[PDB]
Amino acid sequence: TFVDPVHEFAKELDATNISIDKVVGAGEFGEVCSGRLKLPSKKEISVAIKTLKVGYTEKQRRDFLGEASIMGQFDHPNIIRLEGVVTKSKPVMIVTEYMENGSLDSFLRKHDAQFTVIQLVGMLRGIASGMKYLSDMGYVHRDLAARNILINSNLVCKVSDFPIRWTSPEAIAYRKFTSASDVWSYGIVLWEVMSYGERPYWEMSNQDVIKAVDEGYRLPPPMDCPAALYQLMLDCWQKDRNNRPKFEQIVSILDKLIRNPGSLKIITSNLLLD
């Protein structure tokens, strides 16, 4: 079980063991970079590093470190791993798993139509597995989107980031956030992946995204989308949250498609009334 909130769930790292190789850019609370971490066993690994800005407010420190207090509760191959934090020296740091290929949406946009269906399904199965664990822990992510999935050198996808287009109708209507609203979001991610990082609902007015979805309109099948995967999207997007599949069922569905790849050969900016 997830416990809503740092030292309980995050290792305090010795800054001697951290080196910075490359500055990426500016994050919400400070800088973002990458480098290397020397583990207690002397093994050396690549890591992502983010710092808290100089002259931070106490609120900024709390919100920044709050990420670590959440992330550190999870230990799963499809959830970004927290290596630890540095708090006893400044700048304050959060050190996480290095993901060579960055955010999934931007990665797929650079590789439009260049992966096999089975490769895409493998990415999707990893995301679903991470979400099955989060939901098993009682954690509702609320921001599941391809931009919040990171992808490593071997194309393994992992949930990160601990949004009307990704949010279920009931969560928009009255803030009813549950694991079933994360399943809705997963359906949007499925569409994003099969579309190679197209933006869900493109740049439709937010009021129209809300109204169209409420009226029963859904994102259309991506080009060359397997029927099984478009149906899975529609199932994730059931109006009745109780009729959406559970994450365990989504993992099982994708596992069957991986085991029977011939099933994927059956092929299915305007919205379709569902």
Site of tokens 């992992």: 158
Separation CA 240–CA 216 (nearest Å): 11
Residue 59 φ then ψ, to 5°? -60, -45
8 is in an annotated binding site: no
26 is in an annotated binding site: yes
187 is in an annotated binding site: no
262 is in an annotated binding site: no
28 is in an annotated binding site: yes
Burial class (CB in 10 A: 0-12, 13-18, 19+), 259: exposed
* Start-to-end Cα distance in the chain: 36
Helix, coil or strand: residue 13:
coil
Burial class (CB in 10 A: 0-12, 13-18, 19+), 260: exposed
The catalytically annotated residue of 63, 136, 143, 235 is: 143
Contacts 24+ apart (CB under 8 A), 108-112: 108/146, 108/192, 108/193, 108/196, 108/197, 109/196, 109/197, 111/196, 112/196, 112/197
29 is in an annotated binding site: yes
Is 208 considered catalytic here? no
Report how many helices (DSSP H) and strands (DSSP E) the chain contains, helices first: 8, 9
50 is in an annotated binding site: yes
122 is in an annotated binding site: no
What are the binding residues for ATP? 24-32, 50
Q: Point out the residues that are catalytic.
A: 143
Binding-site residue positions? 24-32, 50
